[PDB]
Amino acid sequence: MKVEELIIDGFKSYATRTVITDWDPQFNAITGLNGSGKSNILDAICFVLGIASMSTVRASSLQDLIYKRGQAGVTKASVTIVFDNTDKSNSPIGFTNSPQISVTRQVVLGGTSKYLINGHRAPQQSVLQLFQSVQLNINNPNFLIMQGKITKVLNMKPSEILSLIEEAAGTKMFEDRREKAERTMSKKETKLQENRTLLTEEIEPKLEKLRNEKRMFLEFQSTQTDLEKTERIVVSYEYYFDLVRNIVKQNEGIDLDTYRERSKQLNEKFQELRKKVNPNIMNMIENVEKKEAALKTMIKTIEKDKMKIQETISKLNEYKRETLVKTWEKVTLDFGNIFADLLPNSFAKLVPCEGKDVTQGLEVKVKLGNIWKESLIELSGGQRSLIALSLIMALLQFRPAPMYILDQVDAALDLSHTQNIGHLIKTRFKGSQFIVVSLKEGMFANANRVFRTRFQDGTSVVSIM
Amino acid sequence: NSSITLRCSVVEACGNIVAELAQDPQTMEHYKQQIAVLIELLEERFQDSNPYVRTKAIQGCSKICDLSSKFNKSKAKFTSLAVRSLQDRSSLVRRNSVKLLSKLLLK
DNA sequence: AAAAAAAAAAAAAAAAAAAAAAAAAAAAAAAAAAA
DNA sequence: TTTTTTTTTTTTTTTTTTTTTTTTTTTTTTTTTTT
Numbered sequence: 001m002k003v004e005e006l007i008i009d010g011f012k013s014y015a016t017r018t019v020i021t022d023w024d025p026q027f028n029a030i031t032g033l034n035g036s037g038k039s040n041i042l043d044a045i046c047f048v049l050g051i052a053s054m055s056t057v058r059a060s061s062l063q064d065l066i067y068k069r070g071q072a073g074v075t076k077a078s079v080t081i082v083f084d085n086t087d088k089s090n091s092p093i094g095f096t097n098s099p100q101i102s103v104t105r106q107v108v109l110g111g112t113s114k115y116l117i118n119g120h121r122a123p124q125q126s127v128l129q130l131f132q133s134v135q136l137n138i139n140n141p142n143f144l145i146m147q148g149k150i151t152k153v154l155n156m157k158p159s160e161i162l163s164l165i166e167e168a169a170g171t172k173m174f175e176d177r178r179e180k181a182e183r184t185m186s187k188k189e190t191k192l193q194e195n196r197t198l199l200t201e202e203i204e205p206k207l208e209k210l211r212n213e214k215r216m217f218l219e220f221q222s223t224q225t226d227l228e229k230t231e232r233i234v235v236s237y238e239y240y241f242d243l244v245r246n247i248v249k250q251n252e253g254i255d256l257d258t259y260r261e262r263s264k265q266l267n268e269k270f271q272e273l274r275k276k277v278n279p280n281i282m283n284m285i286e287n288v289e290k291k292e293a294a295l296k297t298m299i300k301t302i303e304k305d306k307m308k309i310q311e312t313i314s315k316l317n318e319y320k321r322e323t324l325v326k327t328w329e330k331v332t333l334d335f336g337n338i339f340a341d342l343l344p345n346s347f348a349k350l351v352p353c354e355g356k357d358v359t360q361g362l363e364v365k366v367k368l369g370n371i372w373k374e375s376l377i378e379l380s381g382g383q384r385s386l387i388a389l390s391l392i393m394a395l396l397q398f399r400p401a402p403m404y405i406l407d408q409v410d411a412a413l414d415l416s417h418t419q420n421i422g423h424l425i426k427t428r429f430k431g432s433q434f435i436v437v438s439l440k441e442g443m444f445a446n447a448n449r450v451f452r453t454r455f456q457d458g459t460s461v462v463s464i465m
Numbered sequence: 466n467s468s469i470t471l472r473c474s475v476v477e478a479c480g481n482i483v484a485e486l487a488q489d490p491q492t493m494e495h496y497k498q499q500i501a502v503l504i505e506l507l508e509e510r511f512q513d514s515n516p517y518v519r520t521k522a523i524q525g526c527s528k529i530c531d532l533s534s535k536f537n538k539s540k541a542k543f544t545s546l547a548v549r550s551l552q553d554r555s556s557l558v559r560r561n562s563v564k565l566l567s568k569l570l571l572k
Numbered sequence: 573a574a575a576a577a578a579a580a581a582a583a584a585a586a587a588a589a590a591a592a593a594a595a596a597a598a599a600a601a602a603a604a605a606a607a
Numbered sequence: 608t609t610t611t612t613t614t615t616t617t618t619t620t621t622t623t624t625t626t627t628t629t630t631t632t633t634t635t636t637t638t639t640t641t642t
C-alpha cells in the first residue's frame with residue numbers, strides 16, 4: 001500500500017484543502033522551517049489511521065484537531081489518504097479488485113468522528129481491521145517514531161519491546177482479541193451464572209407447584225365427568241319428549257332425595273375447585289415444560305460453546321509462542337548485524353528477562369567493543385537513536401510494513417550518521433514507503449521526493465521542492 | 466407501569482380511539498364521558514417523564530384535531546398546552562408541538 | 573399510487589483506557605562520632 | 608583514619624479518579640420497492 005495522494009481538510013495547521021501528490025514509493029522526505037506543519041502532516045496520517053490516546057497527536061480533545069479549534073470558519077476536519085494497489089501481495093483482504101483505496105476520517109464540532117472508505121461510510125472497526133492487516137496499527141506501532149521519541153525507545157518497558165516483535169510476528173491482533181475475549185467471556189459468564197441461579201430459585205419451584213395443580217386438575221376433571229353424567233341424569237329425571245323416556249328406561253327408579261343431596265355435594269366441591277385450579281392448566285404445563293426443556297438445552301449448548309472456545313484459544317497459544325520464538329531469533333540476529341553495520345565495533349541483542357520467559361518481555365543489551373553494557377542508561381542520545389533505528393530496520397528485514405513514519409530521528413545523530421541513514425534508506429532498506437521529517441540536509445538530500453512545508457497567511461502549504 | 470413502551474402504547478390507543486369516533490350519529494350520545502375522560506387523559510399525558518410519551522400525546526392530539534364535528538372547546542386547550550410545551554427539554558416534543566400548532570392553525 | 577421494510581441518525585446512560593497526580597518505599601550521599 | 612548510623616532528598620513504581628470517546632439500545636426519519 002504505497003501512498004499516492006494525501007488530502008487534508010481543516011486539520012490543525014491546515015485550513016484549506018491541501019492535496020499532496022507525487023509520493024515516491026521508496027523515500028519521501030518532509031522539510032521546512034520551525035512551526036511550518038510537518039508534524040501536523042504526520043499527525044494527519046496518524047489521525048486517518050486511527051488514534052485513541054490523543055497525546056500522540058498532541059491534543060486534549062477531538063475538536064482541538066480542527067483549524068483554530070473549529071472557531072475560525074472551518075468547522076470540519078477531514079483527512080483523506082489514497083493508497084495504490086499495483087502490488088497485490090501487500091493488499092488487504094477483499095480489496096484486491098480495486099486499484100486505489102481511499103480512507104477518510106471526518107470530525108465536526110460537538111460530536112465524534114466517522115470513517116469512509118472509497119466514498120462509502122464505514123465504522124471504526126472496519127478501517128481498524130483494514131489497517132491492522134498490513135500491520136499499520138497506530139495504537140501499538142512498530143513503524144512510528146514521533147518527534148522527540150527516538151532517544152526514548154530504549155526506555156520502554158519489556159512488554160512494549162515484546163509487542164514490537166509480536167506485531168512483526170503477526171500475533172498482536174490475536175493477543176488483544178484474546179484478552180478482549182477473556183473479559184467478554186467473564187462478563188457473560190457472570191450474567192449466565194445469575195441466570196442459572198434465577199432458573200434454580202424461581203422456575204422449578206413454580207414448575208412443581210404447576211405439576212401439583214396438574215394432578216389436582218385430573219381429579220377435578222374426574223369430578224367434571226361426574227357432574228356431566230350425574231347432574232344430567234338428575235335434570236332428566238326431574239324434567240319428567242321421547243328422548244327423556246329413553247334415558248329414563250335405563251335407570252328406572254332412582255331415589256330423588258339422595259340424588260339431590262349428591263348433586264349438592266358435587267356442586268360444593270365444584271365451587272371449591274373452580275377457585276382452586278384453572279381449567280386450562282394442561283396446555284399451560286405443556287408450554288412451560290417445552291420452555292424449560294429448550295432453556296436447559298440452550299444452557300448446555302452455551303457451556304459446551306465456552307468449553308470449545310477456551311480449548312481453542314489454549315491450542316492457539318502454543319502456535320503463537322512458537323512463531324514468537326521463531327520471529328525473535330531472526331529479528332535479534334538482524335538487529336545485531338544492522339547495529340554492527342551502522343555503528344562499527346558494536347553489537348546488540350534482544351534477550352528474555354532474567355529468569356522469566358521470552359513471552360514475558362524482552363530487553364535490549366548493547367556491546368561496544370568486547371564489553372557488555374549492564375545498563376543502557378549510560379549511552380548517548382545518538383547511540384540510543386542508532387539502536388532504536390536498527391531495531392526498527394530489523395523489524396523491516398523480518399516483514400516490511402508499507403509505511404515507516406520517522407519524525408526527526410536524526411536530531412541526536414552527527415553529520416556522518418545522518419548521511420549514512422539517508423544512504424541506507426535509499427540503497428539498502430528498499431521495500432517500504434518512508435515518510436521522514438528532517439531539518440538536517442544530509443538526510444533529505446539523499447531523498448527521492450522532498451516536500452517543503454511553509455506557513456503563509458494563517459495556513460500551511462506543502463510545496464513539492 | 467415503568468416501561469415506556471406500554472405508556473406510549475396506551476397513549477396512542479387513546480389518540481386513535483378518539484380520532485376514529487368522529488362520524489356523528491353514534492358518538493356524542495352513546496359514549497360521552499368515556500371519550501371526555503380520554504380527552505382529559507391525553508391532556509394530562511403532556512407531563513410524562515420520558516419524552517416519547519409526551520410525543521405520542523402530542524401526535525394523538527394532532528390527529529384528533531383533523532376531524533371536527535364536535536369537541537371544539539378542546540381545541541383551545543390543545544392550543545394552550547402546545548404553546549406551553551413549545552419550550553420543553555427534548556427537541557422531539559418541541560417539533561411535534563410545532564406540528565400540532567400548525568395543524569390547529571390550518572383548521 | 574400507497575404502504576412496508578431497512579438503514580441511518582439522535583439521545584441518554586454506561587464502560588474502558590490513558591493521563592495526571594499523589595503516596596510510599598528504597599537507595600544513595602554526606603556528616604559526625606568513636607576506637 | 609575508617610566504619611557505622613542517622614537523616615534528608617530524589618527517583619521509581621503503583622494506585623486511584625476523572626474525562627473523553629466509544630458503544631449499546633430504542634426510536635424516528637428517509638428512501639426504495641412491491642402489490
Ligand SMILES: [Mg+2]
Pocket residue numbers: 038039147407
Ligand atoms: Mg515537529
